[PDB]
Structures are given as structure tokens and as C-alpha cells.
Amino acid sequence: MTAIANRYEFVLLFDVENGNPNGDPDAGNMPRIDPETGHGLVTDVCLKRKIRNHVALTKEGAERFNIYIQEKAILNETHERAYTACDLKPEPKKLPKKVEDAKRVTDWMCTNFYDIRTFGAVMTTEVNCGQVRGPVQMAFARSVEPVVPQEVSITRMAVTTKAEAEDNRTMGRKHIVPYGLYVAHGFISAPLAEKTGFSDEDLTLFWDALVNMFEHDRSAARGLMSSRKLIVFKHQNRLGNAPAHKLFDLVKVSRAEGSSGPARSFADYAVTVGQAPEGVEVKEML
Amino acid sequence: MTAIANRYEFVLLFDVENGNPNGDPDAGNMPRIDPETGHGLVTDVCLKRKIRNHVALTKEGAERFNIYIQEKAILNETHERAYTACDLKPEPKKLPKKVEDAKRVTDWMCTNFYDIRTFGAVMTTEVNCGQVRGPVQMAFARSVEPVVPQEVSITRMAVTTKAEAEDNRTMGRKHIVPYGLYVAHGFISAPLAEKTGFSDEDLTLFWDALVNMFEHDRSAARGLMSSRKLIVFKHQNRLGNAPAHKLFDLVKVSRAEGSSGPARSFADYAVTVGQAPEGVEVKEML
Amino acid sequence: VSLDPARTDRPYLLGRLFAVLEKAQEDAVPGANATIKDRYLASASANPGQVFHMLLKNASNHTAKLRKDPERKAIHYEIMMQEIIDNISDFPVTMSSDEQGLFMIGYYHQRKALFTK
Amino acid sequence: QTAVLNKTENISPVLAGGLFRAMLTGGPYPQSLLPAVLGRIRAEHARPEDKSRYRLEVVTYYRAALIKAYLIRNRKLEVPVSLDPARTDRPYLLGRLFAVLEKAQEDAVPGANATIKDRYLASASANPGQVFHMLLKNASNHTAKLRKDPERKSAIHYEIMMQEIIDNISDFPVTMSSDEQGLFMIGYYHQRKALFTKK
DNA sequence: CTGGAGGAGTTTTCGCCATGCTCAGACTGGCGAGTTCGCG
Numbered sequence A, B: 001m002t003a004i005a006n007r008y009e010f011v012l013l014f015d016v017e018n019g020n021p022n023g024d025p026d027a028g029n030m031p032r033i034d035p036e037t038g039h040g041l042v043t044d045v046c047l048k049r050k051i052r053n054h055v056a057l058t059k060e061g062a063e064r065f066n067i068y069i070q071e072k073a074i075l076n077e078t079h080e081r082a083y084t085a086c087d088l089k090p091e092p093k094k095l096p097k098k099v100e101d102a103k104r105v106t107d108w109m110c111t112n113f114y115d116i117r118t119f120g121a122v123m124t125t126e127v128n129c130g131q132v133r134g135p136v137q138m139a140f141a142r143s144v145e146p147v148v149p150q151e152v153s154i155t156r157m158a159v160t161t162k163a164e165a166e167d168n169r170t171m172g173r174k175h176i177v178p179y180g181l182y183v184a185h186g187f188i189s190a191p192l193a194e195k196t197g198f199s200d201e202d203l204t205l206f207w208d209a210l211v212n213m214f215e216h217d218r219s220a221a222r223g224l225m226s227s228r229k230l231i232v233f234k235h236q237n238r239l240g241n242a243p244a245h246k247l248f249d250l251v252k253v254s255r256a257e258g259s260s261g262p263a264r265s266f267a268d269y270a271v272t273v274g275q276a277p278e279g280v281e282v283k284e285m286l
Numbered sequence C: 001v002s003l004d005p006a007r008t009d010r011p012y013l014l015g016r017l018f019a020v021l022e023k024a025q026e027d028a029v030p031g032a033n034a035t036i037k038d039r040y041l042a043s044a045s046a047n048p049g050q051v052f053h054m055l056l057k058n059a060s061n062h063t064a065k066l067r068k069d070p071e072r073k074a075i076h077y078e079i080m081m082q083e084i085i086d087n088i089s090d091f092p093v094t095m096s097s098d099e100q101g102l103f104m105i106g107y108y109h110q111r112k113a114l115f116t117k
Numbered sequence D: 001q002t003a004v005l006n007k008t009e010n011i012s013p014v015l016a017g018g019l020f021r022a023m024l025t026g027g028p029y030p031q032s033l034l035p036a037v038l039g040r041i042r043a044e045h046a047r048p049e050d051k052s053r054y055r056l057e058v059v060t061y062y063r064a065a066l067i068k069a070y071l072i073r074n075r076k077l078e079v080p081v082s083l084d085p086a087r088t089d090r091p092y093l094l095g096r097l098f099a100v101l102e103k104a105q106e107d108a109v110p111g112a113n114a115t116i117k118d119r120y121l122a123s124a125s126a127n128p129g130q131v132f133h134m135l136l137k138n139a140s141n142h143t144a145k146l147r148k149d150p151e152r153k154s155a156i157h158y159e160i161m162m163q164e165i166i167d168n169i170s171d172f173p174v175t176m177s178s179d180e181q182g183l184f185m186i187g188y189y190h191q192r193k194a195l196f197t198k199k
Numbered sequence E: 001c002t003g004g005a006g007g008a009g010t011t012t013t014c015g016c017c018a019t020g021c022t023c024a025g026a027c028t029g030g031c032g033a034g035t036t037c038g039c040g
Helices: A044-059 A075-086 A103-111 A114-119 A190-196 A200-216 A244-248 B044-059 B076-085 B099-112 B114-119 B190-196 B200-211 B244-248 C010-028 C036-046 C052-067 C076-085 C097-114 D013-025 D033-043 D061-075 D090-108 D121-126 D132-147 D155-166 D178-194
Strands: A008-019 A122-124 A128-131 A136-138 A141-143 A150-156 A170-188 A224-235 A251-255 A269-273 A280-283 B008-019 B122-124 B128-131 B136-138 B141-143 B150-156 B170-188 B224-235 B251-255 B269-273 B280-283
Touching (some): A103 A114, B076 B099, B150 C036, B200 B224, C010 C052, C010 C076, C036 C052, D033 D121, D033 D178, D090 D155, D121 D178
């Protein structure tokens, strides 16, 4: 699984409209926000789940394309399979001595799980199998402008469990965001890839997953969400040729001169891309 | 239960005259609005309720078309029916810890109830039958222009209780919208239908219900409401060939030549549809 | 914050005008069982274009009584009305909710001033 | 007090730990406290059927104390221990005004089932600019009834309050943040106690 | 060429509980006083 040979970085944009992009487990189910300024947030963990789902849907369990964090699975059982395949006994919270190097089981897992090969995992549980760091990383997403969530009240004409106190009604409430625009950042490193074999076809599949991510995620709460832009910076050698923060500065988002009042559609904003240094090439059509 | 084999998108239009399309329980009983721009709103659950009512009225409890009767029902007493039919004994809060029988109850529910087969539900109550996601989804309906509610005063000849006024005895209130036009979006997913068994005849019944939704919904406060247009986009393979937001843009609505300020009839607007990409089929005669 | 005679927001001016008209009526017919505030307050704030042409008639009708007495208190109201209307251009046919809130604010600001020393 | 139903079974572990930690150490409170209390305030609807004939209050002593503490510590504001007639903060002023409106209504129509507190508490705090005009309009009907009373009961007093309070406002805001809603609740609580407290 | 061993690295034995509800009202309260310009 020949590894890539360059450093990559990218930017992504996506929308939301009359929906809840990511609910907060604590504050009822309010959308996550920054209490100091009112800007919205989305945890990176949320996106990786969508990518995993898309890969599982499109490849349908093809060999060397399984996913490790599967719905309601038991992880320790999966670890034990590696020992069975490589045919050596496990030990409680310990790895085999290098006579049959643990690299055997490590490779056996990295070779046939896509998500482990891409993001890494923590696997030093009672049945120990080591650790991985993952050559792909991404940070929290934030909205360009503050958002104003609002709450909705609804009713149902049925009851669940022997509400004898009434046969009668019941009510609940839900929260939504009228409109919002978000930005995200990510990185890819070659040296880490060389330890796991992250290859080019994987990268193409990754681009496709990013582009088509949301089209399969409709639900009663998400409303309408879509992706809008994708810009990729590629370095010309194994180690970069410019600081990251300089590159991200080349992309600027501002409100259309004619728009006024609160934003309500992507047409209210304007996007512009600058000129990159000599050592990097900017490709955008994605 | 042979599932459909394509992806669908659709748009619906309808308007109201001298009525309240949907009241807000948390602000007197005014129509729902967007507080920042004055555009009206209607929750999807209202349309779902109307569709359920129409289906129940037209089919009349035929086999495999039970509507999961919602008016004054107790749900756990319905789940226990699935448990007993499969000959299982429900656990205090868990599905049977035996995979085959665990899905048998869920399959039984999905088979018998139409609305479960179409929209899904949550059944993880004290007696547990699982979860469902539902192939069909809809978003909030939004008006094309700001609306201006009017408030009207009412009187009455009598009193309800022991009030010592002693003739005229009481006064009331109403809210109505002189006129407005709304738009709705929706989606249908093939992979989920392949899980629940949503079939074509169900799709035909769904089209019919959408067309004839309001005919049976006359009421004192509703006024007059009706549907005007319906456009359907049918993709040519199991997974789409274009983003949805591009498709929704092919439909445009604007004032006719004789704008003449306030709009008071459907004749005051003009509707047009563009040309769809080669990978999508557009049919509008519905 | 208090009455600002230079704001020039049309709902604000309408609110002030309503208060001065009510004051004039109260002066003209003491102890009336019913007052314009009870009869019209709801209607005027929503659709100014429909009722003000009526209120202004009774305004003159009331001022006629006062100006016909030795009670000279009675061109003050006419002067105030001239000042306030001087900034208006037309009567709105309908108004939004926030505009109605501003109307009420202007009314209350105006009313307080009339009762100062 | 913050449980869904007033029962210990529903207490969130995060708050359980965080409150104790902050108490011992003096650090900031958990950030989820304020929305947690606000949800309970905005969701509850007590009814006369309760044993106590007078209907239950939802803005209780404990909740107000909690909101005051949270605002003082995390947000670095200032709050008095009782009504202060020289505050001049828009949320505070609106909270004050709501109380006098309710007082006038309940005097005009004794024994009503549905007071304005039962129908407008949430939206008014959330979107003041959308509802207040109706409340003001109804206040006219409520006050006029008292005026025609042979005794005139109040009528002048309430109008004097309404005039003096309003004089410090310029416009109704369209939307408010959480802390603004907390200030609104505090203002409502203080004013309520100011009444009923001459004798 | 073999030894003895000092030091580096790995394995074994150690001993092995607890914290406990509560509970209720007020009150009733009257603003102030005002003047318009003027030829060919």
C-alpha cells in the first residue's frame, strides 16, 4: 500500500437551513455555541462519523474496507481476532514479546480496516494491541457570523405509559437554526502515512466522501444541509514549503455588498481566493 | 416487500385565504412567523398529520394499512401486541436478548403499520421494539413574502359559569392571514426503503394523498386552503446524479406583470421551471 | 431618556399626536364615561390611515368650545399640533409589530410631559 | 430544584460534581447551569387543581438565588439584593413592567384561569418586540374598568408606575441572550415583592 | 580459556467492606394650567 509523498491541506464550506446541525447532550438539545460571542460550533467527531457511514454505504463491506467502530459492537472481541489470525495467544493487558512481534497483529489490523488506517485508534484494552496516531486530522468548525437559535413547541395526541392521571395530550419542544455558514480545516502528513500505507486511491475516495457526504444524511431534525466549496493546497516535496496559517489566510469570506440585514442564503456572501507562494499549487474545481 | 430503486425529490405549493394555517401555542395563538423577517412558517408534523388522516379515511383499516392509531391511544399496549404475536415475553426495558426474535417483532410492526413503514418512529419504551428512521422526510414550509396578520374582535350572548355581571356577556378574539403562498421540499431514500420494504403502490398512494390533502380538513378557523403545483425529480440510478440544491434552483416564483401591490390571488404570481441535467428526469403534470 | 422633540420617527410622532388629542378631549368634556382611548386605541395603532381623519374632526369640535370661552389654554393645542404634524408626510396604511411598539413608546413619552409643572 | 420533576432521580451527575467543586474551590460554575434552570422555568405550567388554592409560583426563591450567583460569578455583573429603582437596564426594566401588567389584570378580572403569565412568559422574554404591543393594548381595557368604579379603587397609581418606568426605554429589542433573560427574571422577581409590601 | 561477579533486567509477594425526609403570604395606592404674523 504505497504511501503518498506530499503534504496536503484543505478548506471546506457547508450550509444549514432550519435545522439543528449538532445538538448538545447537556443543555437540553440546544445547538452548540460559544457563550461569549454567540458563534456556532460543530465537533470534528461528528464529521468523521458521516465519512465512515458514506464509506460503509458505498463499498458495502468489500475486503480491506471494513470499519472498526461499528454500530453497537464489542471491541475486545475484534482485538482477539487479530491474535487468532496471526495465531498466538493473548495476555491480560500485555502485548506479545517480540519473538512473534506485535507488529504482526498491528499490520494485520492496519491492513484491513479503513478507518483505523486513516484516523488511528486507541487499542490498549484488556486485550492489548497497541496504538496508532492517524495521518489525517481536522479541527472544530466555526460559523463566520453569530447565530440566533430559536425554539419551537409542538403537541402529540397520544400518551405512552399508563398516564392514569388523565387518553389525553402531551407536548414537547424542539430547537432550530434559521441559517448559518461554517468553515473547517484539515491536514495530511506523509511521514505518518508511510507507517500505515495510506495510498492514493484512499485519498481519491476521501475527496469523494467529502464532496458527497451530506446527501445520505437526511433526518427529521437536520433540515437541509449541503457543501459549497473545497480548496486543496498541495506541497511540492515531502515536507512543506510555507506555514499553514499563511495559506488559510488566502481564503476570505465577506458579505455581498448589496445584502443587508440578517443573512438567509448563500447568495448573501462572497468568496475569494488569493495567490499562493511558489512552492505550493492551489487546485479548486473540487 | 419490494423496495423502490431510485432517488426522488419534489416540491409542493399551496396557499390560504382568511385563515390561520398553523397557530403558535407559546404566543397566544398567532400564526408561526420568523421574528426577524416576517415570513410565515408551518411545521412538517402538521402535513404529516394531514396525510395520516387522509390515508385512514380512504383505506378504512384494510390489512397492512393500520395507521398506528394516534388519537387517544396508548402505545405500549400496541407494542405488547407485537410481543405476544411473536410469542415472546417482553422484558422490563430491553429487546429480547436473542437476535432473531429481536427483529421479528420489529419486522411485524413494520409490516402491519403503514405510517411506521413510511415515516418511522421511536419504540424504546418500557416494552422495547427498536428504532426506525423512515425513508420519507420533509422540511419546514416557508412563505414567499412577508405576511401581515389581522386581529378581529368577537362577542357572545352567554356566560359559562357563575359570573355576577347581572344582555351582552363576553368578548373574544381571532387572528387571520388575508393571503399567503408557501413552498415545501422533500426527499426519498432508496437504501432505507430497502430496509423497511416501502413499495411502489405506497408511493402512488402517497402522491394521491399529497394531491388531495386539504379536501377533508375544513374547519372553523382554517378558512380555505388548497394545493396548486407539484414537481417531481426522479434520478436514474440508486444514488443521485446531482446535488439537490441545484435541482431546487430550477423552480422560480415571482410576481406577474400586474403586481398592483398587495397579492390576493394565485393569479398574481408566475411560476417557471428550468431544464434538468441529463441524469435526472423531471415530470410536472402531477 | 425622555421626550425627544427631534426624533422624527413617524410612529413616534403619531404616538405623540394621539396623546395630545386625548388631552384636548379630556379638557373639553370633563368626566366623560367613554374616551377616545377606549374607543379607538386598538384600531389606530394598527391602521393609522383609517381613523385619524375622524379623530381630527372631533379635535376641532372640542377646541371650538374652549376658544369660545374666556379660557385661554385655547391655541396652545393648535400650536402643538402644528409643530408635530410639521414633520409628517403621509399616513401609513398599515404598520408592523415593532412599529406599533414604537408608537406606544412615543405615546407614553408624550403623556408624561403634559403633566409636568 | 433543577430536576425535570422535583425528584432526586433526575439530577445530572455533571452538575452534582461541578457545583460541589466550585463551592469548595471558588472557581467558575458549570456553564450548563443557566440554561438548565431556564428550561425548567419556561416549561412548567402549574394549575389551580393543586391543593394550595393559590396557584403555584414558578420563579421561586431558590432559582432566583441561583441565577444571581451565576451572573455575579461568571459574567461579572452587579445585582442588588432587592428592588433598585435606579437601575435603567432594558431587561431589568421589562421584567419590572411585566409585574405591574399582571397585577393590573388580576385586579380587573378576579379569579381568571388564564393570566398573561400563563400565555406570554416565554415569548415575551425571548422576543420582546413581538408581543408587548398586545399586552399594552389590553392594559387599557383592564385599567379603564377600575376608573369607572365608584371608588376608583389603584387606577392612577398603576398608570403612574407605567409612565415612570417606561421613561427610561427607547425601543423594544428584537432578541435577547440567555443572561439577558436572567436579568429579566430577576427584575420580575424583585418588582413582584415590592408590591404586597406596604402593610 | 576459563572463572567469579557486578550490574542490568525480569518475576513474586505483599493484603485485601460501610453514611441520613420534612414545611407557607402579603396590597388596595388621585399628575397641571399655555399664545401665532402683517403694503405698495
